[PDB]
Design an enzyme around this catalytic site. Structure first.
Site, PDB file in Angstrom:
ATOM      1  N   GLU A 201       0.824  -1.230   0.000  1.00  0.00           N
ATOM      2  CA  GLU A 201       0.000   0.000   0.000  1.00  0.00           C
ATOM      3  C   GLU A 201       0.852   1.271   0.000  1.00  0.00           C
ATOM      4  O   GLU A 201       0.299   2.325  -0.333  1.00  0.00           O
ATOM      5  CB  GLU A 201      -0.997  -0.048   1.129  1.00  0.00           C
ATOM      6  CG  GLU A 201      -0.473  -0.009   2.479  1.00  0.00           C
ATOM      7  CD  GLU A 201      -1.562  -0.007   3.576  1.00  0.00           C
ATOM      8  OE1 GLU A 201      -2.774  -0.279   3.331  1.00  0.00           O
ATOM      9  OE2 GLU A 201      -1.193   0.198   4.751  1.00  0.00           O
TER      10      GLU A 201
ATOM     11  N   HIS B 189      -5.448  -4.526  -6.660  1.00  0.00           N
ATOM     12  CA  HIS B 189      -5.832  -3.507  -5.658  1.00  0.00           C
ATOM     13  C   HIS B 189      -7.023  -2.670  -6.126  1.00  0.00           C
ATOM     14  O   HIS B 189      -7.680  -3.031  -7.136  1.00  0.00           O
ATOM     15  CB  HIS B 189      -4.613  -2.693  -5.254  1.00  0.00           C
ATOM     16  CG  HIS B 189      -3.827  -3.280  -4.133  1.00  0.00           C
ATOM     17  ND1 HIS B 189      -2.908  -2.535  -3.385  1.00  0.00           N
ATOM     18  CD2 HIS B 189      -3.850  -4.504  -3.562  1.00  0.00           C
ATOM     19  CE1 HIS B 189      -2.438  -3.300  -2.428  1.00  0.00           C
ATOM     20  NE2 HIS B 189      -3.003  -4.491  -2.496  1.00  0.00           N
TER      21      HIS B 189
ATOM     22  N   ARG C 164      -5.051   6.358  -2.902  1.00  0.00           N
ATOM     23  CA  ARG C 164      -3.599   6.464  -2.850  1.00  0.00           C
ATOM     24  C   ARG C 164      -3.049   6.974  -4.204  1.00  0.00           C
ATOM     25  O   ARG C 164      -1.989   7.579  -4.225  1.00  0.00           O
ATOM     26  CB  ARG C 164      -2.948   5.151  -2.396  1.00  0.00           C
ATOM     27  CG  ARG C 164      -3.507   4.699  -1.090  1.00  0.00           C
ATOM     28  CD  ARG C 164      -2.514   3.911  -0.312  1.00  0.00           C
ATOM     29  NE  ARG C 164      -3.144   3.288   0.817  1.00  0.00           N
ATOM     30  CZ  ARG C 164      -3.461   3.978   1.859  1.00  0.00           C
ATOM     31  NH1 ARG C 164      -3.129   5.230   1.978  1.00  0.00           N
ATOM     32  NH2 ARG C 164      -4.040   3.349   2.871  1.00  0.00           N
TER      33      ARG C 164
HETATM   34  O1  LIG Z   1      -5.955  -6.234   5.933  1.00  0.00           O
HETATM   35  C1  LIG Z   1      -5.847  -5.000   5.701  1.00  0.00           C
HETATM   36  O2  LIG Z   1      -6.315  -4.116   6.448  1.00  0.00           O
HETATM   37  C2  LIG Z   1      -5.103  -4.580   4.463  1.00  0.00           C
HETATM   38  C3  LIG Z   1      -4.249  -5.458   3.922  1.00  0.00           C
HETATM   39  C4  LIG Z   1      -3.468  -5.249   2.668  1.00  0.00           C
HETATM   40  O3  LIG Z   1      -4.160  -6.038   1.603  1.00  0.00           O
HETATM   41  P1  LIG Z   1      -3.440  -7.051   0.490  1.00  0.00           P
HETATM   42  O4  LIG Z   1      -2.704  -8.053   1.317  1.00  0.00           O
HETATM   43  O5  LIG Z   1      -4.603  -7.604  -0.389  1.00  0.00           O
HETATM   44  O6  LIG Z   1      -2.516  -6.154  -0.340  1.00  0.00           O
HETATM   45  C5  LIG Z   1      -3.372  -3.740   2.417  1.00  0.00           C
HETATM   46  O7  LIG Z   1      -2.771  -3.577   1.130  1.00  0.00           O
HETATM   47  C6  LIG Z   1      -4.761  -3.128   2.533  1.00  0.00           C
HETATM   48  O8  LIG Z   1      -4.770  -1.770   2.082  1.00  0.00           O
HETATM   49  C7  LIG Z   1      -5.251  -3.196   3.956  1.00  0.00           C
END
Ligand SMILES: O=C(O)C1=C[C@@H](OP(=O)(O)O)[C@@H](O)[C@H](O)C1
Length: 424
Positions: A311, A340, A385
């Site tokens: 992120e 994403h 973002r």
């Molecule tokens: O569990 C969470 O709160 C998140 C996990 C991540 O997801 P991914 O593992 O699918 O990238 C992150 O990128 C997202 O913005 C928030």
């Protein structure tokens, strides 16, 4: 829609900024509070909660399940029972956390719950979690949005194997509700390339705060024992990922930005964040309960592994684009960003190159060669973002305008005001 002109920084940015709560922590606390309430443990309050589209979607999703969530500010109180109405329909928006954390929770009720989301959400990974729920005996109609979970008032649990390479949220979503499954759950991620380790660890830490016994001692396997979820008061930290956008202003302008209330011990990936800023020769200190970042006079290209913290990619890509002319930076570990809010690899490449930059997508990330940029219209792709990355670019390139700054409401509705106040 009118564009948002990204203010320039003709001189160093100097500011103290307060960022609102962590989206990831707020949405876990809402789920855990819902489980405690549903089990009969009473009401829980979340202090410092983020109020944003993703957390509103989560609190609305809990209310769709029959719970009550009170509070007009940052203090949210969850109470009630899982008792969804006929044809209950959860709106997931573009919130991965609602899409992935709420189906398990719903599988605990005795009423079928439908899940839908924005058009753009329909492109994001979900099928592996739905298959894992079916393996656990939940009837699920559909393999993508919209889908329906046909709960019958309990979920047996047991052991399940999942490919979570597309999203750590598949693991977190199973883990959150597992203590309420008759025999708990043992989840095994199969294969390799599991992104976002800190977010799975966040889930485990918050479970332990609620008194759940989770064994995470072996990589790629988690065992949660059946048991109560305690009703407790939650204290939410500032969102460190959003703080990076503001800290980036210090970095690119050789200025000084302080973030108030920065935790010295965090449930978020603070240590990864601070190490990346230090890669660029920013000076990072803890003082007066804040974090202060002093940017360098300039910086060259960097190679950064973002597998654990994907992120950060939009902000980090903006930083790479603004390195000294001719610098090459390589962002790696982030194939999963194709799934994403938008395909962030593709979107960052398009938008940087539109401004005259040089960003090449690779199988697992981006290679960015810093070159002089020019004015243009930086498109947000409905992604908070992406919008904030254009703001970072605009500090150092006159005439950059973000099409849709309101995409920032996903996690940071006051971004325009906070950013303006920072740049002065
Ligand atoms: O569990 C969470 O709160 C998140 C996990 C991540 O997801 P991914 O593992 O699918 O990238 C992150 O990128 C997202 O913005 C928030």
């Amino acid at each position: 829609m009118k564009t948002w002109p990204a203010p320039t920084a003709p001189t160093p940015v100097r500011a103290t900024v307060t960022v609102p709560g962590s989206k990831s922590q707020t949405n876990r606390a809402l789920v855990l509070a819902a489980l405690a309430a549903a089990q009969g443990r009473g009401a829980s309050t979340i202090s410092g909660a983020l109020r944003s589209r993703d957390t509103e979607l989560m609190l609305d999703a809990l209310q769709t399940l029959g719970l009550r969530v009170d509070g007009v500010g940052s203090e949210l109180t969850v109470s009630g029972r899982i008792e969804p109405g006929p044809g209950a329909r959860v709106d997931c928006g573009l919130a991965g956390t609602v899409l992935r954390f709420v189906p398990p929770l719903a599988a605990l009720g005795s009423v079928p719950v439908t899940f839908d989301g924005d058009q753009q959400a329909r492109g994001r990974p979900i099928a592996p979690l739905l298959d894992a729920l079916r393996e656990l005996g939940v009837a699920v109609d559909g393999t993508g949005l919209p889908f329906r979970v046909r709960g019958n008032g309990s979920l047996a649990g047991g052991t399940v194997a999942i490919d979570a390479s597309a999203s750590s949220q598949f693991v977190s979503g199973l883990l959150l509700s597992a203590a309420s499954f008759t025999d708990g759950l043992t989840v095994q991620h199969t294969g390799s390339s599991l992104p976002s380790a800190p977010h799975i660890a966040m889930t485990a830490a918050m479970l332990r705060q609620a008194g759940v016994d989770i064994d995470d001692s072996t990589p790629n396997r988690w065992q949660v024992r059946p048991g109560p979820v305690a009703a407790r008061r939650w204290d939410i930290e500032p969102d460190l990922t959003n703080a990076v956008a503001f800290l980036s202003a210090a970095v690119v302008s050789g200025g000084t930005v302080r973030i108030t209330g920065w935790p010295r011990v965090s449930v978020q990936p603070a240590d990864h964040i601070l190490a990346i800023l230090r890669q660029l020769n920013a000076v990072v200190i803890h003082a007066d309960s804040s974090l202060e970042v002093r940017g360098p006079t300039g910086y060259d290209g960097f190679d950064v592994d973002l597998r654990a913290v994907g992120e950060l990619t939009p902000s980090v890509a903006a930083l790479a684009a603004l390195a000294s002319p001719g610098s090459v930076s390589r962002l790696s570990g982030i194939a999963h960003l194709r799934g994403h809010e938008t395909d962030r690899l593709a979107a960052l490449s398009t938008e940087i190159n539109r401004l005259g930059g040089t960003c090449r997508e690779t199988p697992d990330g981006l290679v960015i060669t810093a070159t002089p940029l020019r004015p243009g219209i930086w498109r947000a792709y409905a992604d908070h973002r992406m919008a904030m990355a254009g703001a970072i670019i605009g500090l150092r390139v006159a005439g950059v305008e973000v099409d849709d700054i309101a995409a920032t409401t996903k996690t940071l509705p006051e971004f325009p005001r906070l950013w303006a106040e920072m740049v002065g």
